[PDB]
């Protein structure tokens, strides 16, 4: 019960931050019950869910989340329940990675890349030691609080109660398992996306036709950047043996260790 329940009063909506199929996001300010602090947050209002059977639903997910408490795993500060469910959430202010990613690849050094894929990788490890299956993960659904410091955002569960084929594990597309490992996968296709400077992974291709091309042992390409230490990594995630990938806690330490010598594992433009 670490989950506070807000009270309308205690927050403004400044600005619409996009909208989803999930809900809608805005940048607004929260001043905490007898407090004379002002919070930047971001408000997800959530979407047409009013049956009772859903909101305790809803309910039972948002405690989840809120007890979810690592640096690289975006914090669910309260709920607010009126007329609508409002999922209070840290600000995240440089948007998501992606975005970021497509919008700085000239100034994005070796030394950054490679640190976002240690604290994306530590965030993840986080939710395979709660026993809780990310399903989400893409490069779309990590934000920038810093551009030192990435969060993870946790709603693949909650967006349970427009298909993500190209960031899905083989078991998920085909038999629609999803465990610690097809994570892992997915934190494949996110790296390969970090890598590209935010490209699309497979383009141009149907999603119907992916399965059949991942049976023909084709995977994502090689990135430019990218050295063989690395790009291996890459296609570990990608393993048909969902055993055979690498853990969450094995890809923090190749990563880690990776990061002490940037430029040694990732050819930029200098330096
Ligand atoms: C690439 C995927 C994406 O756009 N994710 C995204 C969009 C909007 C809102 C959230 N939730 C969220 N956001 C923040 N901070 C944040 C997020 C996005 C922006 N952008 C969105 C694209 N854009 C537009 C449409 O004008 C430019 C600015 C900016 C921003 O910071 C002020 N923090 C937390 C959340 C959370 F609720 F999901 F936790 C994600």
């Known amino acids: ?150 969060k993870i955002t946790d709603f693949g569960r909650a967006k349970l109660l427009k298909v993500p084929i190209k960031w899905m594990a083989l078991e998920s597309i085909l038999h629609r398992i999803y465990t610690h490992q097809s994570d892992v996968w997915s934190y494949g296709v996110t790296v390969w996306e970090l890598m590209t400077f935010g490209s699309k992974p497979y383009d141009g291709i149907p999603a119907s036709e992916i399965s059949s091309i991942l049976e023909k042992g084709e995977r994502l390409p090689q990135p430019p950047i990218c050295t063989i230490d690395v790009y291996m990594i890459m296609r570990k995630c990608w393993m048909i043996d969902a055993d055979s990938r690498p853990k969450f806690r094995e890809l923090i330490i190749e990563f880690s260790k990776m990061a002490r010598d940037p430029q040694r594992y990732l050819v930029i433009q200098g330096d």
Request: charged share 25%; glycine share 6%.
């Open 1 to 150: 019960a670490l989950l506070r329940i807000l009270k309308e009063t205690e927050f403004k909506k400044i600005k619409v931050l996009g909208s989803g199929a999930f809900g809608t996001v805005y940048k607004g300010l929260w001043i905490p019950e007898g407090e004379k602090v002002k919070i930047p947050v971001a408000i997800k209002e959530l979407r047409e869910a009013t049956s009772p059977k859903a909101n305790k639903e809803i309910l039972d997910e948002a405690y989840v989340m809120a007890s979810v408490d690592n640096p690289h795993v975006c914090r669910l500060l309260g709920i607010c329940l009126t007329s609508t469910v409002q999922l209070i959430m840290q600000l995240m202010p440089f948007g998501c990675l992606l975005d970021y990613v497509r919008e700085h690849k000239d100034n994005i050094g070796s030394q950054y890349l490679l640190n976002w894929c240690v604290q994306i990788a530590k965030g993840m490890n986080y939710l395979e030691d709660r026993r809780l299956v990310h399903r989400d993960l893409a490069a779309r659904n990590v934000l920038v609080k810093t551009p030192q410091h990435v």
